[PDB]
C-alpha cells in the first residue's frame, strides 16, 4: 500500500532525479511532508503492474506516450488544475496529456533527439545520412568513428526509419516503403562496420564523452554529462535521408498522479506550486536539461540557448507520439524488428512483416 502523509515519486534514471529531490526538500522544509524520489529500472513496465492493485508511487514521470495506456486501465487520477494554472503552460502542451477528453497528467517538457557532434573532430557535421559511411572511413584512418548511438531502443532509430515517405504496426501508421528504406540503410551501416549492432546507451555515451566517436544521437538530458566531459560539442539538426529530414517521435515528459494514491491533494500542491515554477524546473534542469519546457515563464528564458533552438528545430521536423493504449505493444514490435534486422537474424522485409502482423 501507498503511505499516507508522504510523497513517493518515480522518474527515469536518465532525467534530473537529484534536482527533483531538491524540489522534494523544499516541499518538506515548508510543509513537513517527506518526498522520496526513486528511479527504478523499467519503471514504465513496473508502474502498470504495481498500480493495478493500488501500489506504486504517488507520482510517476514518463513521456506522454505511455500515459494513454495507464489512463485506459484506470491507473491515473484525473488532475484538477484550475483555468489560471493551465494558462501558465503553452496551450498545446495540454493536449499530449488529455485522454478521452480528460487531463491525466501535467506536461513538463518537450524532448526531441538531436545530432550531437564533437566540433574538434568534426567542425562541419554531415548534412546527410548517406555520407556517413564515407566520413567513417576517413575518421577510421585516424583511430576514430563517425557515429555511435543507442541501437537497442527504437526511440533512437525511429528518426531514420521514419524519414522517407494496413502496414500499421500495432495501429500506428507507418510508411511501408519508407520504413524499409530507413531500416535497410541502418542494417547496411552495421554490415559495413560503421556501427555495431550491440551498441547501447552506455557504450555510445562513453565513446562520445571520451572523444572516440565524432557524433551521437541523444536528447537534452544527455548534455550535462557531456559538459562534465569537456568535449567541445555542438547540438544540431539531424541528417537528412533520401533528401528528407530525419523525423523523431517526440515525447512530452509528463507527471501523472496514481489513481490509488491517498495523497492526491499533496501531489497536486507539489506539482503545481513547487515543480511547475521557475525555481522548481530550474532545479531539475541544472541537474539534467529538460528540453523545451511547457511552463511559459521559464521556457522563455531557456529558448535563447542554441542547444534548445536545435532541439526545437528537430522537433518541428518530427511528430508528437500518439498516446493510444497500443503504444507499449507498438514500441516492443519495433524494438524486436530493429534488433532482429540489425543482427542479421532476419531480413528487413521479414522483420517489418512480423511487426505488421497482429
Amino acid at each position, epitope marked *: 500500500k501507498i503511505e499516507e502523509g508522504k510523497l513517493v515519486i518515480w522518474i527515469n534514471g536518465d532525467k534530473g532525479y537529484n534536482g527533483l529531490a531538491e524540489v522534494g526538500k523544499k516541499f518538506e522544509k515548508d510543509t513537513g511532508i517527506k518526498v522520496t524520489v526513486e528511479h527504478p529500472d523499467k519503471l514504465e513496465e513496473k508502474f502498470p503492474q504495481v498500480a493495478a492493485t493500488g501500489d506504486g508511487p504517488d507520482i510517476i514521470f514518463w513521456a506522454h506516450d505511455r500515459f494513454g495506456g495507464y489512463a485506459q486501465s484506470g491507473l491515473l487520477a484525473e488532475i484538477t488544475p484550475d483555468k489560471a494554472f493551465q*494558462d501558465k503552460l*503553452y*496551450p*498545446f*502542451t*495540454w*493536449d*499530449a496529456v*488529455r485522454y478521452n*477528453g480528460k487531463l491525466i497528467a501535467y506536461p513538463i517538457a*518537450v524532448e526531441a533527439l538531436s545530432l550531437i557532434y564533437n566540433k574538434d573532430l568534426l567542425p562541419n557535421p554531415p548534412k546527410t545520412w548517406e555520407e556517413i559511411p564515407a566520413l567513417d572511413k576517413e575518421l577510421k584512418a585516424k583511430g576514430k568513428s563517425a557515429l555511435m548511438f543507442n541501437l537497442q531502443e527504437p526511440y533512437f532509430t525511429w528518426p531514420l526509419i521514419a524519414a522517407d515517405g494496413k502496414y500499421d504496426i500495432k495501429d500506428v501508421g507507418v510508411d511501408n516503403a519508407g520504413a524499409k528504406a530507413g531500416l535497410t540503410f541502418l542494417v547496411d551501416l552495421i554490415k559495413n562496420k560503421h556501427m555495431n549492432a550491440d551498441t547501447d546507451y552506455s557504450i555510445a555515451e562513453a565513446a562520445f564523452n571520451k572523444g572516440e566517436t565524432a557524433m551521437t544521437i541523444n536528447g537534452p538530458w544527455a548534455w550535462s554529462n557531456i559538459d562534465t566531459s569537456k568535449v567541445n560539442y555542438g547540438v544540431t539538426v539531424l541528417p537528412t535521408f533520401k533528401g528528407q529530414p530525419s523525423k523523431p517521435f*517526440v515525447g512530452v515528459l509528463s507527471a501523472g498522479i496514481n489513481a490509488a494514491s491517498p495523497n492526491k491533494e499533496l501531489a497536486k500542491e507539489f506539482l503545481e506550486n513547487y515543480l511547475l515554477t521557475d525555481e522548481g524546473l530550474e532545479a531539475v534542469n541544472k541537474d539534467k536539461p529538460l528540453g*523545451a519546457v511547457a511552463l*511559459k*515563464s521559464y*521556457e*522563455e528564458e531557456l*529558448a535563447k540557448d542554441p542547444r534548445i533552438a536545435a532541439t*526545437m528545430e528537430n*522537433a*518541428q521536423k518530427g*511528430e*508528437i507520439m500518439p498516446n493510444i493504449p497500443q503504444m507499449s505493444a507498438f514500441w516492443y514490435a519495433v524494438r524486436t524488428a530493429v534488433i532482429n534486422a540489425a543482427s542479421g537474424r532476419q531480413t528487413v522485409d521479414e522483420a517489418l512483416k512480423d511487426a505488421q502482423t497482429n
Partner: antibody
Amino acid sequence: VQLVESGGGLVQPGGSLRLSCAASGFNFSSSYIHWVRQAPGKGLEWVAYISSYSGYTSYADSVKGRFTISADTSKNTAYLQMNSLRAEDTAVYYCARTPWWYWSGLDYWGQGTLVTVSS
Amino acid sequence: DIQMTQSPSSLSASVGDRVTITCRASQSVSSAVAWYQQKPGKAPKLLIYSASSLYSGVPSRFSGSRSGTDFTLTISSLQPEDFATYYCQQSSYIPVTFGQGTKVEIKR
C-alpha cells in the same frame, strides 16, 4: 499541400450553414484546425479551433453557443457548423492550421469562403 | 481575452525605405507571436513565428524581434510588391487573438 473550404454562400438570418475544410499534404491527426473570419473592410477575427490529437475545442466569445467546430481525422476534413446566423457573422471564413508544436504560426490557410447573412 | 495593439495603423513609405511595425500585447504573452501579410482579396500568409523565426521561403528583408512586451516587424528595404495589411497574432492564450492590422502603402 492544401486546405479547401466549401459550403458558404447566402444564408437567411437565424439560419444555419455547415462549412467544410478538406485538408491534404500534412499530418492532419496531430494538427489543430482554426477558423478565422474577416468581415468586409475589417481585421481578422479568430473564432474557433480544434485539436485533432485530443478533440479539444474552444471558441471566441462572439460565437459561443451558436457555432460548433468538429473534425473527422479519417477523411482529413474539419467542420464549422454555424447556427442562429446573424448579420454580424457576415464575413469571408478561413480555415487554417497549426502543427502539434506550440511555437508555430498558422502556416497553411484556405482560400476563404464568403458567408452572407441577409433575407 | 488578450488584445494586441499595432502601431501605426497605417503608414506610407518609399521603395527602399526601412519599415517598422510594432505590436504591444494587452498582458504578457511569451515570444508566442506570429506576423502575417495579407494582400486584399486573399488569405493571410505567415511571415514570422515565435517572434523572430523567418518562415521557410519568406524573403530575408522581413524580420521579427522582441523587446519585453513590444514585438517589432521590420522590412529592411521596402519593395513595390509589399503593400498589404500586416497582422501580429498571439498564441500564448486561447482565444487566439490578432492585432488590428497595419496598412502599408508605397509612397512615390
